Design a protein around this ligand. Sequence first.
Ligand SMILES: *[C@@H]1O[C@H](CO)[C@@H](O[C@@H]2O[C@H](CO)[C@@H](O[C@@H]3O[C@H](CO[C@H]4O[C@H](CO)[C@@H](O)[C@H](O)[C@@H]4O)[C@@H](O)[C@H](O[C@H]4O[C@H](CO)[C@@H](O)[C@H](O)[C@@H]4O)[C@@H]3O)[C@H](O)[C@H]2NC(C)=O)[C@H](O)[C@H]1NC(C)=O
Ligand SMILES: *[C@@H]1O[C@H](CO)[C@@H](O[C@@H]2O[C@H](CO)[C@@H](O[C@@H]3O[C@H](CO[C@H]4O[C@H](CO)[C@@H](O)[C@H](O)[C@@H]4O)[C@@H](O)[C@H](O[C@H]4O[C@H](CO)[C@@H](O)[C@H](O)[C@@H]4O)[C@@H]3O)[C@H](O)[C@H]2NC(C)=O)[C@H](O)[C@H]1NC(C)=O
Ligand SMILES: *[C@@H]1O[C@H](CO)[C@@H](O[C@@H]2O[C@H](CO)[C@@H](O[C@@H]3O[C@H](CO[C@H]4O[C@H](CO)[C@@H](O)[C@H](O)[C@@H]4O)[C@@H](O)[C@H](O[C@H]4O[C@H](CO)[C@@H](O)[C@H](O)[C@@H]4O)[C@@H]3O)[C@H](O)[C@H]2NC(C)=O)[C@H](O)[C@H]1NC(C)=O
Ligand SMILES: *[C@@H]1O[C@H](CO)[C@@H](O)[C@H](O)[C@H]1NC(C)=O
Ligand SMILES: *[C@@H]1O[C@H](CO)[C@@H](O)[C@H](O)[C@H]1NC(C)=O
Ligand SMILES: *[C@@H]1O[C@H](CO)[C@@H](O)[C@H](O)[C@H]1NC(C)=O
Ligand SMILES: *[C@@H]1O[C@H](CO)[C@@H](O)[C@H](O)[C@H]1NC(C)=O
Ligand SMILES: *[C@@H]1O[C@H](CO)[C@@H](O)[C@H](O)[C@H]1NC(C)=O
Ligand SMILES: *[C@@H]1O[C@H](CO)[C@@H](O)[C@H](O)[C@H]1NC(C)=O
Ligand SMILES: *[C@@H]1O[C@H](CO)[C@@H](O)[C@H](O)[C@H]1NC(C)=O
Ligand SMILES: *[C@@H]1O[C@H](CO)[C@@H](O)[C@H](O)[C@H]1NC(C)=O
Ligand SMILES: *[C@@H]1O[C@H](CO)[C@@H](O)[C@H](O)[C@H]1NC(C)=O
Ligand SMILES: *[C@@H]1O[C@H](CO)[C@@H](O)[C@H](O)[C@H]1NC(C)=O
Ligand SMILES: *[C@@H]1O[C@H](CO)[C@@H](O)[C@H](O)[C@H]1NC(C)=O
Ligand SMILES: *[C@@H]1O[C@H](CO)[C@@H](O)[C@H](O)[C@H]1NC(C)=O
Ligand SMILES: *[C@@H]1O[C@H](CO)[C@@H](O)[C@H](O)[C@H]1NC(C)=O
Ligand SMILES: *[C@@H]1O[C@H](CO)[C@@H](O)[C@H](O)[C@H]1NC(C)=O
Ligand SMILES: *[C@@H]1O[C@H](CO)[C@@H](O)[C@H](O)[C@H]1NC(C)=O
Lengths: 263, 263, 263, 130, 130, 130
Amino acid sequence: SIPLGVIHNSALQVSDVDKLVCRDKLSSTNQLRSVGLNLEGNGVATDVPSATKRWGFRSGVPPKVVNYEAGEWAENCYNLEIKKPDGSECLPAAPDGIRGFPRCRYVHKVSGTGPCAGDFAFHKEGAFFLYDRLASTVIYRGTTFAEGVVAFLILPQAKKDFFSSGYYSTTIRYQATGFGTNETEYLFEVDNLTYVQLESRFTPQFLLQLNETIYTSGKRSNTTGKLIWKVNPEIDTTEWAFWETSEELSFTVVXXXXXXXXX
Amino acid sequence: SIPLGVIHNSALQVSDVDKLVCRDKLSSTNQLRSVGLNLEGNGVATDVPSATKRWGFRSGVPPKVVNYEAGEWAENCYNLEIKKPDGSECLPAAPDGIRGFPRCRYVHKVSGTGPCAGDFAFHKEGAFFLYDRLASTVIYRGTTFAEGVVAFLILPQAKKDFFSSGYYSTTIRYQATGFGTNETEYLFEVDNLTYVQLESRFTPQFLLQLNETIYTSGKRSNTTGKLIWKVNPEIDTTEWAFWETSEELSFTVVXXXXXXXXX
Amino acid sequence: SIPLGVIHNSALQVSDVDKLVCRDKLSSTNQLRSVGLNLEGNGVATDVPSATKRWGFRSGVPPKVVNYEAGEWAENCYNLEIKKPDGSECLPAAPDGIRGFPRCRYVHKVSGTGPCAGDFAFHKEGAFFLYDRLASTVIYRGTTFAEGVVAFLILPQAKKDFFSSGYYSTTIRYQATGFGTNETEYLFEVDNLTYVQLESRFTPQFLLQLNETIYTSGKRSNTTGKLIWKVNPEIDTTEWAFWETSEELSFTVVXXXXXXXXX
Amino acid sequence: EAIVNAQPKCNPNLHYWTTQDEGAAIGLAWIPYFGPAAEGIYIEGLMHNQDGLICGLRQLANETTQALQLFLRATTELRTFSILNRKAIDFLLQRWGGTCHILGPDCCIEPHDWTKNITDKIDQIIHDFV
Amino acid sequence: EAIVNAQPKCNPNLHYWTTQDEGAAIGLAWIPYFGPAAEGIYIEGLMHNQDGLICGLRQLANETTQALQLFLRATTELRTFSILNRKAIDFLLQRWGGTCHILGPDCCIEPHDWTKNITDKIDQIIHDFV
Amino acid sequence: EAIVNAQPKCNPNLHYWTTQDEGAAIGLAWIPYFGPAAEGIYIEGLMHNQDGLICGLRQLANETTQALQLFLRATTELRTFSILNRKAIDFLLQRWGGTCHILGPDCCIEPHDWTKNITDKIDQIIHDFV
Ligand SMILES: *[C@@H]1O[C@H](CO)[C@@H](O[C@@H]2O[C@H](CO)[C@@H](O[C@@H]3O[C@H](CO[C@H]4O[C@H](CO)[C@@H](O)[C@H](O)[C@@H]4O)[C@@H](O)[C@H](O[C@H]4O[C@H](CO)[C@@H](O)[C@H](O)[C@@H]4O)[C@@H]3O)[C@H](O)[C@H]2NC(C)=O)[C@H](O)[C@H]1NC(C)=O
Ligand SMILES: *[C@@H]1O[C@H](CO)[C@@H](O[C@@H]2O[C@H](CO)[C@@H](O[C@@H]3O[C@H](CO[C@H]4O[C@H](CO)[C@@H](O)[C@H](O)[C@@H]4O)[C@@H](O)[C@H](O[C@H]4O[C@H](CO)[C@@H](O)[C@H](O)[C@@H]4O)[C@@H]3O)[C@H](O)[C@H]2NC(C)=O)[C@H](O)[C@H]1NC(C)=O
Ligand SMILES: *[C@@H]1O[C@H](CO)[C@@H](O[C@@H]2O[C@H](CO)[C@@H](O[C@@H]3O[C@H](CO[C@H]4O[C@H](CO)[C@@H](O)[C@H](O)[C@@H]4O)[C@@H](O)[C@H](O[C@H]4O[C@H](CO)[C@@H](O)[C@H](O)[C@@H]4O)[C@@H]3O)[C@H](O)[C@H]2NC(C)=O)[C@H](O)[C@H]1NC(C)=O
Ligand SMILES: *[C@@H]1O[C@H](CO)[C@@H](O)[C@H](O)[C@H]1NC(C)=O
Ligand SMILES: *[C@@H]1O[C@H](CO)[C@@H](O)[C@H](O)[C@H]1NC(C)=O
Ligand SMILES: *[C@@H]1O[C@H](CO)[C@@H](O)[C@H](O)[C@H]1NC(C)=O
Ligand SMILES: *[C@@H]1O[C@H](CO)[C@@H](O)[C@H](O)[C@H]1NC(C)=O
Ligand SMILES: *[C@@H]1O[C@H](CO)[C@@H](O)[C@H](O)[C@H]1NC(C)=O
Ligand SMILES: *[C@@H]1O[C@H](CO)[C@@H](O)[C@H](O)[C@H]1NC(C)=O
Ligand SMILES: *[C@@H]1O[C@H](CO)[C@@H](O)[C@H](O)[C@H]1NC(C)=O
Ligand SMILES: *[C@@H]1O[C@H](CO)[C@@H](O)[C@H](O)[C@H]1NC(C)=O
Ligand SMILES: *[C@@H]1O[C@H](CO)[C@@H](O)[C@H](O)[C@H]1NC(C)=O
Ligand SMILES: *[C@@H]1O[C@H](CO)[C@@H](O)[C@H](O)[C@H]1NC(C)=O
Ligand SMILES: *[C@@H]1O[C@H](CO)[C@@H](O)[C@H](O)[C@H]1NC(C)=O
Ligand SMILES: *[C@@H]1O[C@H](CO)[C@@H](O)[C@H](O)[C@H]1NC(C)=O
Ligand SMILES: *[C@@H]1O[C@H](CO)[C@@H](O)[C@H](O)[C@H]1NC(C)=O
Ligand SMILES: *[C@@H]1O[C@H](CO)[C@@H](O)[C@H](O)[C@H]1NC(C)=O
Ligand SMILES: *[C@@H]1O[C@H](CO)[C@@H](O)[C@H](O)[C@H]1NC(C)=O
């Protein structure tokens, strides 16, 4: 059976389907709630290289969608525009009435290419892709999602403190090659000709600070060609979870153009 | 909460959600009914110029549809084919399984152009567009609707007299410019080159009589160009609601051709 | 009302809606079951010529779909690719999430032409076309179905023996002209240039044996043109229902090529 | 609440249409292939304003709109068919969602005839005390 | 009504397929990415005609068709999934939709053990009358 | 079962969003034409880990996934909206799906006040035995 959460003896438990508790009271369908919870909140790595390894392509399995009524504000959401090397789309367009996840601090928007060896992209750990009050087994094209899971509850009619500063969202753009494989490569986009080679250890706050440093220091490409900066390991960056947590960078340049950013 | 109608003390009332009346009996889902009622029945102006001012275009709001099981025969329904000046469609095609309102005495079919500054056309007073047992927040292209609202009832199982001459429908065609704005202009269509300048005061019965007079008197266009008749204010026409309610017209002609119809 | 099956006094009966039996127990929605049963199981003729006469085209009636949870393994299923003589499709594409019937011993795949005088193809006896846990009033293009009907049951919670060698399926291909009419003609396909003229009396087992005899005897077309074999009436073939039930064939040849297969 | 019609006019008669959800079919007319087209499935009738129910119903539909529109804004279903079934469930949960305490104002169990079974049975042992 | 099979034949055995709605999953097989394709989600079994239930069921499905087709003609849902849930609601409303009058033929409350609680309690004060 | 959080971390606070399914509308804001766009229909709040409910809820969602995924594999609906309504129906059928035998462990009828009606009525005829 699908588990149902209930509060007994000041503690949340799964409802036992064998037993019958006559003191349990369900006086309205309003006491029943579905809730989406973000994998973020369990301490999983949220950087793009770590996150994308949890997703994979597969054929033969029809997609499935289930609604949920309330969700959690996310620090990290993702939005994918992946094509095959031949230019065809890897991900289907969002079905009618499936809009993006409504509360994201950072939207990690990834564009690029991969082999995409399967009709739909699924979560390898069996989690869902959370959209606007609809959770799907698959990723839709160009549509912001959070990784998450769904719970179902009987709320006690007494406890009213159960789902009743502004909202700001920032898009972080990435280019990718070999998407959905072992040899995937990511670049953080400063502008259309200025990039930074991406590491797992880079937080959103570091990426945004690095980009603002590049703009103000004047280390963008002043040439028709592509400028890819690199950050060697002795550069500091922000293992702590998001809820519990300048003029020092020297840039040096080594068709194309590779380069190093030292400290 | 969504109100629910119930009959107590020989009178229809909204069911009180706080109270519990144990004498109320719901022995089947058949006792529950949804009903569509036409704005017509509340005395609203039904002429095309008045009716179309109640509708407006808006973006950012997803459309929504709700079913209803029984409806009211309408005197006036509407069917819109509006384009922008560039030829693109202002209204979306009817979704699968949304057919026109099933009982209309007059279908006011309007074709023409407007700026259509929004993705969907909504009712400015929050009413619905009633189709075949589906009520929508928006207007679909080329699909006959009545303006209306929905009620929900618990019927008493005793009263069987609650939803258990032929049916004739007439299409009245109009051309429009500046649709959905302040300076909208309407023409009643007699044939493809013969028109009448529309006023709010013209009833369907007057329009049909005027058209039949024009045909039999022989005052249609006998020329490649467009003939637009006008009716100056001293001409009589049928303020009473529809449920409670010749050789005297002299025509005179003033590229194009304007003209007056006197009495 | 829609009938509901219940077991009383060791016998299945329709539940009486007027009566109320307090000893009847429905302790879960799991006790409610919808089941698809195949027309096959009632002894109807399953050969393609007999089967296709039960289907017909009609306009003005919207299609309808209803789910069912459990079904019966079919001996005979059908899959239709019919066009009009002008090349346009007679049948609509399968809607999203409508897949073929999951257990068919023989899939009778018919390709060809007919007048198709109607927007959808319905069952003339009011039966359904059974797909993967969805029963439809209409035939979808290129999608395997069984002819069947649906029952609804309250299972007794005691009787657990109620819906809890491998599965092999064989496609038998046919070409048709004048599909859905009185003068329909069918050919069984051995290869793309070798055919057999179809009779109602030919079982799937006979068709497969005949084809294997043609291949091993070497009586396929060895020419650019079409070879159509015929079987005159003194040839034996397998009136018994499917659940209760060589080197002797001499071939002789009479642009095109007609011929006879004797015994 | 009581229903107070506050509209400019009221058409006091309701010429309605609906479907026959369970028609007593006439031979083969129930078979989709032979039956009526979409336009021919309707039945009609006429209701008058006995007990002011037509004028009440027009007003009820009007007043229902706000809550219905707010419900539709909050749902993600494109087409909503479940409002009446949800009302039925809530009817049942209101009465039978907890323990039914007999003689309480929220328990719909009548033991009046059950008293007459045992109040007739006062004399089954107190009168027969030989 | 009783079910009378009036078909030309009856296959008395039912080789069925269905889904395991709650499978006891084997490691990671429940994860869509790793699990079976659409064709591999079925379980099978075989039911015989004990109590004539298979032949009854074939006839029941046949007889169900008219009312089901008339129901589908009258609905505007393109795909109907709610028939069994509506049956469940109607089961409940038939019994619990009004006031339950104890000892009535339409109230499913049994007070037999409740009599034994109070009929054992006749002697709690009439026998102890010291 | 008890809920045991077995995750690497737990964010003990839940900054949530949801819709106001029944907003106390402000003038004409309920009318779709005038109201907010899709992005402006949300309300927010913050729940803390009183009674360990946030950490329990994260674990509950995690543990729910397998059964939910197996349910979605077995359904043919493309979008499932009916899980909570089906829970409500099953809540009711568990209690009221059969005959309610009073004083049994599966009947949720309380006759305690009903005893006090008739135990007060012992003296209605045994004390008044003039
Ligand atoms: C509910 O909550 C639980 C607990 O948090 C989650 O449990 C996770 O389950 C997944 C399986 O789906 C686990 O993922 C797998 O981890 C394996 C072990 O990883 C460790 O291995 C190295 C070497 O020992 C360690 O140094 C390091 O700590 C690693 O973390 C991997 O072997 C697996 O990868 C391999 O198999 C998979 C097959 O799925 C392939 O795709 C890979 O390519 C690779 O070959 C895999 O990554 C995860 O570790 C579990 N976490 C914990 C904390 O136990 C559930 O996922 C969660 N449920 C939902 C629905 O979210
Ligand atoms: C339920 O039933 C009630 C009662 O019948 C309906 O009430 C109507 O509500 C709408 C609002 O949605 C009203 O429409 C508004 O009327 C205003 C007043 O109109 C009068 O103003 C002049 C000058 O005083 C009078 O001479 C004349 O009598 C007019 O009728 C207008 O000011 C409004 O227009 C302006 O604001 C709107 C914003 O919505 C703009 O779109 C316009 O461009 C314009 O700037 C507006 O027309 C209506 O008057 C009410 N009727 C009555 C009888 O009170 C509900 O609508 C109904 N509910 C549903 C869902 O149908
Ligand atoms: C539930 O189960 C019952 C019982 O098995 C099924 O009953 C069948 O109902 C259909 C009607 O829909 C019957 O089909 C019709 O049979 C008529 C008689 O056929 C016999 O006629 C000749 C001459 O007398 C006999 O020699 C021979 O035995 C034939 O079988 C035909 O006249 C009908 O065809 C004509 O009318 C139809 C109109 O529907 C046209 O389309 C045709 O072109 C033609 O003009 C028609 O074929 C069938 O015979 C019944 N069977 C039995 C055993 O009685 C139900 O169909 C079943 N329900 C479902 C939903 O499956
Ligand atoms: C991909 O992963 C590693 C590279 O990190 C490589 O050694 C391995 O061979 C590749 N896997 C497969 C299945 O080819
Ligand atoms: C960057 O490129 C994209 C298209 O790839 C374009 O939409 C955008 O305007 C470009 N921006 C600049 C600053 O050139
Ligand atoms: C990069 O920095 C520039 C300079 O202020 C800013 O305009 C741009 O939005 C930054 N990029 C991101 C992703 O924030
Ligand atoms: C132009 O780009 C070079 C690197 O290619 C960089 O060193 C320099 O700062 C840029 N020019 C200016 C004026 O900043
Ligand atoms: C449109 O309406 C009137 C004309 O009737 C005009 O005076 C007014 O300026 C216009 N409204 C707007 C918003 O421009
Ligand atoms: C009028 O014009 C329409 C196309 O705009 C056409 O369908 C119709 O046949 C025309 N009728 C006549 C009488 O010319
Ligand atoms: C206009 O009058 C003619 C002449 O009888 C008629 O054929 C036509 O249908 C009339 N138009 C309408 C809209 O009734
Ligand atoms: C031809 O049209 C004129 C107006 O342009 C009208 O006066 C006249 O009656 C028409 N001809 C006939 C024969 O009716
Ligand atoms: C088709 O059926 C027969 C041929 O078997 C033919 O005699 C009859 O005239 C045809 N039916 C119709 C309606 O034309
Ligand atoms: C037979 O023809 C079909 C196309 O009509 C084709 O797909 C198939 O490969 C052909 N087979 C052979 C053996 O030629
Ligand atoms: C026809 O016989 C050949 C020869 O073995 C075989 O390959 C083919 O599958 C047969 N056709 C069918 C429909 O079984
Ligand atoms: C070639 O086809 C002919 C019939 O056209 C047939 O008799 C003969 O057996 C075939 N050839 C061989 C070698 O089998
Ligand atoms: C209830 O009433 C009947 C008479 O109608 C009586 O014979 C019976 O004994 C009573 N029930 C019990 C349990 O005593
Ligand atoms: C019901 O039965 C028990 C013994 O099983 C008895 O002790 C108890 O007093 C009775 N209940 C009441 C309320 O008297
Ligand atoms: C139950 O209690 C009231 C007092 O609260 C008493 O007057 C009444 O007689 C009792 N009911 C019956 C049916 O005797």
